[PDB]
Amino acid sequence: PYLRARGEVFSEIFPIDEAVVRVLVEELKEAFEKYVANHKSLRLDRYQL
Amino acid sequence: EAVKGTSDPAMLADTIAYHATWTVAEKQEILELTDLEARLKKVLGLLSRD
């Protein structure tokens, strides 16, 4: 200790060709909307949507 | 009508719980939880049973 590391490249993705990706954005927003409210007693906010 | 117009949930919860007159063991069981929402789970389940 202490711990270091070396890295080759800093991986990024800038999203190109957004049509099917945008439809999956709609679908995953729907999925998060169906998932978000389960923690009423389990202490996560509705309002973090 | 003396408890209506209420924002504070602590006096709300304990006022309801004392005014949810039961056997005192389960009054203590209401008093056990420090959380508000699990305590009101207890309370409203009792009142639905009544």
- Asked if B41's CB is within 8 angstroms of A40's CB, the reply is no
Cβ of B39: how many Cβ atoms within 10 Å? Answer: 19
Decide if A48 touches B, using CB distance below 8 A.
no
Decide if B38 touches A, using CB distance below 8 A.
yes
Q: Give the distance from residue A41's alpha carbon to the nearest chain B alpha carbon, in angstroms.
A: 7
Question: For the CA atoms of chain A, what is the radius of gyration?
Answer: 18
C-alpha dihedral, B16 to B21 to B26 to B31, nearest 10°: 30
Tell me phi and psi for residue A16, to 5 degrees. -115, 155
Q: Say which experimental method was used.
A: cryo-EM
Task: Determine the Cα–Cα distance for residues B9 and A11; give it in Å rounded to an integer.
Answer: 49
Decide if B37 touches A, using CB distance below 8 A.
yes
Site of tokens 């270091």? A4
Resolution to 1 decimal, in Å? 2.4
